[PDB]
Amino acid sequence: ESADLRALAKHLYDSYIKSFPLTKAKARAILTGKTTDKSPFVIYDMNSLMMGEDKIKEVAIRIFQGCQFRSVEAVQEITEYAKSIPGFVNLDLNDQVTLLKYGVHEIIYTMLASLMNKDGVLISEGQGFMTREFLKSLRKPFGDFMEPKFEFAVKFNALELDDSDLAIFIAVIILSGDRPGLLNVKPIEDIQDNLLQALELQLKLNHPESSQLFAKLLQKMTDLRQIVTEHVQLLQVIKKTETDMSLHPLLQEIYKDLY
């Protein structure tokens, strides 16, 4: 029954708002807004970076460390959202870990797109905006870790999804039965089948003129995999070149034996 699918869509969107403080709606209002109350301070070079610290050791590493801290925070928010997905907390506890282990980063880059345009990315809960060019200008190990994310974002943002769409799509990503090491795949696939039904109806009702948006959104899950694998390889180079830099334990376990 379609009424049951709309109830699941509403449930996930409600939990989405409650779990993620900075939504796409708020992010787009800051990036495009004529508004005067929520304009961000823009960081585009070293001087503005130093002044931005007042308004809001090596620079490249200090940026990379703050990027980690935000990723850890995003994992915490994604984990809170996953518990709201009907059936997720009832699954085998080991599979819950496995689904989060492989899903968080694919979700992080999906939602990171909400904070991005072709010119840069919002930071500090929308208070700041770091330009895409300043990130490319960083030292050779840290000058390339965001550029692939921007490339995905500009394409993904062309789909013009809103938060109500993303809430369901994010749930579909977590409940993937093809994750390595899943003990009982069937109960996971049964949940995804229902989430996929809810996403399909959501996109046909919210985007009636967007032809095959459902299929085109699912195909984007291939771009996400590429980003993760490329990011993992970049992290291995950094751990060898910078033996004094520390990675967050939560992020270390997520990447432990990923592929």
Where along the sequence are the contacts to ligand QGL (CB under 6 A)? 22, 63-64, 66-71, 74, 108, 112, 121, 123-125, 130, 145, 251
Q: Which of 194, 202, 131, 129 is nearest to 161 (CA)?
A: 202
Residue 11, annotated ligand binder?
no
Least separation in angstroms between residue 114's CB and ligand QGL is 10
Residue 221 or 235: the one with the smaller Cβ distance to ligand QGL is 235
Residue 114, annotated ligand binder?
no
Residue 10 or 70: the one with the smaller Cβ distance to ligand QGL is 70
Residue 138 or 198: the one with the smaller Cβ distance to ligand QGL is 138
Structure tokens at 146: 């965001």
Residue 8 or 166: the one with the smaller Cβ distance to ligand QGL is 166
Residue 255, annotated ligand binder?
yes
Residue 56 or 205: the one with the smaller Cβ distance to ligand QGL is 56
Residue 207, annotated ligand binder?
no
Distance of CA 219 to the CA centre of its chain: 16
Cα 210 to Cα 24: distance, rounded to the nearest angstrom: 19
Least separation in angstroms between residue 125's CB and ligand QGL is 5
Distance of CA 129 to the CA centre of its chain: 17
Least separation in angstroms between residue 256's CB and ligand QGL is 13
Cα 169 to Cα 187: distance, rounded to the nearest angstrom: 18
Residue 145 or 169: the one with the smaller Cβ distance to ligand QGL is 145
* CB-CB contact of 181 with 98 (8 Å): yes
List the strands of the sheet with 116-117, edge to edge. Answer: 41-43, 128-131, 120-123, 116-117
Residue 129, annotated ligand binder?
no
Residue 105, annotated ligand binder?
yes
DSSP letters spanning 122-182? EEGGGTEEEEHHHHHTS-TTTSSSSHHHHHHHHHHGGG---HHHHHHHHHHHHS-TTSTT-
Pairing relationship of beta strands 128-131 and 41-43 according to DSSP bridges: parallel
3-class state of residue 121 by DSSP:
strand
Per the annotation, where are the binding residues? 68-71, 105, 231, 255
Per the annotation, where are the binding residues for rosiglitazone? 68-71, 105, 231, 255
